[PDB]
Amino acid sequence: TVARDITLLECVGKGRYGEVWRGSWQGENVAVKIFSSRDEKSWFRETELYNTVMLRHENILGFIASDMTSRHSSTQLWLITHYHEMGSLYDYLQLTTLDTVSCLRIVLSIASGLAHLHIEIFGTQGKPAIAHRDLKSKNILVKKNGQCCIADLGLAVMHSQSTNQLDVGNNPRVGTKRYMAPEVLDETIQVDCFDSYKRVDIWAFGLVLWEVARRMVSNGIVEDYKPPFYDVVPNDPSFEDMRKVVCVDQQRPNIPNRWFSDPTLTSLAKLMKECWYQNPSARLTALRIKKTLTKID
Amino acid sequence: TVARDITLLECVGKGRYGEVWRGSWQGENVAVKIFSSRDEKSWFRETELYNTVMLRHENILGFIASDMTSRHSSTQLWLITHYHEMGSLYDYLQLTTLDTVSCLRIVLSIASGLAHLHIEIFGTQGKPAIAHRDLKSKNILVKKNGQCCIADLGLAVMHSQSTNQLDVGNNPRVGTKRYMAPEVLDETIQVDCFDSYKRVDIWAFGLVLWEVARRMVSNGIVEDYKPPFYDVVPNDPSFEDMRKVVCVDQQRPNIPNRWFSDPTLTSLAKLMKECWYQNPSARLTALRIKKTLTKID
Ligand SMILES: CC(=O)c1cccc(-c2cnc3ccc(NC4CCOCC4)nn23)c1
Numbered sequence: 173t174v175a176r177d178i179t180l181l182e183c184v185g186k187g188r189y190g191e192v193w194r195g196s197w198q199g200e201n202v203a204v205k206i207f208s209s210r211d212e213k214s215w216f217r218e219t220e221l222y223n224t225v226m227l228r229h230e231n232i233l234g235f236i237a238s239d240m241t242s243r244h245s246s247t248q249l250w251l252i253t254h255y256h257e258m259g260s261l262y263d264y265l266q267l268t269t270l271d272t273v274s275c276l277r278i279v280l281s282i283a284s285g286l287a288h289l290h291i292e293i294f295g296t297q298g299k300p301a302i303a304h305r306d307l308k309s310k311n312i313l314v315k316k317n318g319q320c321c322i323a324d325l326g327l328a329v330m331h332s333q334s335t336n337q338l339d340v341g342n343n344p345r346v347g348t349k350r351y352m353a354p355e356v357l358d359e360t361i362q363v364d365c366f367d368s369y370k371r372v373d374i375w376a377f378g379l380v381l382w383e384v385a386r387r388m389v390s391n392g393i394v395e396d397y398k399p400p401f402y403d404v405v406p407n408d409p410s411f412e413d414m415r416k417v418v419c420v421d422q423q424r425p426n427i428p429n430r431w432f433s434d435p436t437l438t439s440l441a442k443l444m445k446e447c448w449y450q451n452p453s454a455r456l457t458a459l460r461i462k463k464t465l466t467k468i469d
Numbered sequence: 470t471v472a473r474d475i476t477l478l479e480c481v482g483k484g485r486y487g488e489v490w491r492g493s494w495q496g497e498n499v500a501v502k503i504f505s506s507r508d509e510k511s512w513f514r515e516t517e518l519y520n521t522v523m524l525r526h527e528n529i530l531g532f533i534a535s536d537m538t539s540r541h542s543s544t545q546l547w548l549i550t551h552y553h554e555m556g557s558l559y560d561y562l563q564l565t566t567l568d569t570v571s572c573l574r575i576v577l578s579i580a581s582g583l584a585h586l587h588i589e590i591f592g593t594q595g596k597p598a599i600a601h602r603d604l605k606s607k608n609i610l611v612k613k614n615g616q617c618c619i620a621d622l623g624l625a626v627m628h629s630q631s632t633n634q635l636d637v638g639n640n641p642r643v644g645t646k647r648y649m650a651p652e653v654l655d656e657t658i659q660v661d662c663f664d665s666y667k668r669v670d671i672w673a674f675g676l677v678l679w680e681v682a683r684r685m686v687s688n689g690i691v692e693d694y695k696p697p698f699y700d701v702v703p704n705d706p707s708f709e710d711m712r713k714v715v716c717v718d719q720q721r722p723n724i725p726n727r728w729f730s731d732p733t734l735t736s737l738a739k740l741m742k743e744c745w746y747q748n749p750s751a752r753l754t755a756l757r758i759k760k761t762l763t764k765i766d
């Protein structure tokens with residue numbers, strides 16, 4: 173197997189998600205995600221999607237292999253992918269500021285990845301429609317060309333127009349609380365309608381757009397990197413913390429005043445507000461966001 | 470993946486277990502087991518054992534690969550193994566009779582496979598101790614050399630003396646009811662003691678020994694192939710059918726009178742009775758059965 177032939181060179185992250193490593197396979201860099209022992213169902217789902225669907229796309233993390241291997245005399249589940257030295261968008265945004273071109277390249281590349289996930293393609297080229305369900309800056313990697321790619325399909329849900337069947341999987345994991353849409357926090361989400369899940373991804377995308385826009389220079393100024401809702405919830409916020417903020421108070425991230433002095437940031441602000449309607453049906457689609465971002469400059 | 474490159478040539482079985490096919494990979498025969506959609510946890514467990522443990526042995530079905538693939542626009546889980554044209558011991562016993570040498574070759578090869586599963590080996594050659602939990606004539610394949618190999622590790626349980634930890638997995642499937650030991654049917658089995666599981670395998674092995682011995686010629690005569698307990702339970706017997714028979718009535722398969730006129734079959738009868746003690750602790754071990762079968766001729 174690929175696992176047996178990989179040399180783990182450097183651990184680049186460790187947390188509740190397991191571990192992510194830079195390794196080498198046939199002397200080339202690869203990324204290796206080793207899952208926590210509580211998260212076999214996420215490994216199973218990504219393995220399923222990447223093996224059963226045609227998911228090659230510039231803005232979706234490129235898959236190499238998935239294996240089981242033995243380490244410390246116990247089973248490890250490995251996902252092996254392309255390695256992106258620039259790391260996560262979350263960490264990257266904290267280390268640099270962006271000009272207008274770099275900002276728009278990033279957010280467009282993300283909407284193009286998401287739109288590709290969200291659409292069903294037919295023919296032998298095809299793929300089912302896929303919703304992500306845990307989109308966030310930490311699940312987006314930055315490439316040397318300045319575009320991003322979307323990772324972590326362990327919560328993905330799929331839909332096929334042939335059978336009109338929705339495939340939700342059977343994973344007890346839930347999305348990152350900070351980025352959960354009100355209808356998830358409320359538990360009023362229509363779990364039988366595929367559109368519901370795409371709408372959850374759009375909310376989260378709105379939040380990511382906000383995170384990126386803060387780091388775009390206008391009039392030589394920027395905001396410091398902050399996570400969504402940083403001013404109203406603690407670190408590692410609870411369901412209840414988020415529900416109070418999002419459902420009861422109905423808060424949204426504040427737009428800095430300075431965005432209204434810049435035409436790109438005014439457009440981006442309008443875009444993010446249309447991702448955050450409390451009413452899931454009113455939110456923009458990923459395709460419409462992508463067309464609008466193709467038009468901003 | 471191996472799956473994408475395999476040509477399914479002929480389905481050799483279909484049932485509650487999924488499907489088993491003869492296929493070709495790189496122009497050689499292989500077996501492909503496609504799991505039922507309700508049985509992902511068995512696929513996961515076999516994949517785990519065969520990937521994480523060093524399980525190569527003449528009397529254990531030889532593993533090639535495990536994959537996920539898309540067919541009829543849905544996910545299939547494939548186990549790919551060596552192909553054994555002679556098929557299952559269950560079907561084979563119905564199509565031929567055995568002389569003394571062939572009978573003993575079969576039953577010894579099975580006890581040697583089981584003993585290898587049951588023992589922990591240390592060093593870099595090693596493997597944990599493994600109990601099977603669904604041993605039966607249908608889960609044993611016959612090789613052209615007349616020896617058998619043991620298949621279907623989807624219910625396997627493992628133990629390591631290092632950590633003294635028992636790994637039971639998380640599979641809702643239970644063994645074949647007809648072959649369940651009284652302590653399983655009773656629900657008095659000590660689920661925390663590894664020895665309990667080996668003892669369940671020994672009971673089942675006793676039953677398989679009975680099935681094989683019926684087909685060995687002595688004085689030019691044989692019994693017809695019958696499954697264990699054929700005279701007391703229906704096809705597809707229930708837990709309750711089996712419990713009444715095994716726990717309350719305390720029945721055991723009857724030994725044909727003719728076995729007591731033959732010294733091999735008298736030995737084999739003694740061996741099987743020592744596999745069937747109601748008291749799990751009194752039953753022989755797989756290693757002791759193997760040494761005794763090495764001595765019978
Ligand atoms: C985000 C996800 O699920 C996933 C899965 C597999 C590989 C990768 C991957 C590819 N190339 C790189 C480079 C650095 C890196 N480090 C951080 C560690 C903590 O935050 C998340 C990523 N990851 N990563 C990411």
Ligand SMILES: CC(=O)c1cccc(-c2cnc3ccc(NC4CCOCC4)nn23)c1
Pocket residue numbers: 481482483489500501502548550551552553554555556557607608609610620621
């Ligand atoms: C018994 C198990 O679990 C398993 C798994 C994978 C491959 C094989 C395997 C290998 N070579 C062959 C030849 C014939 C065959 N046919 C029958 C069909 C119905 O009864 C069981 C086996 N199977 N099989 C067996």
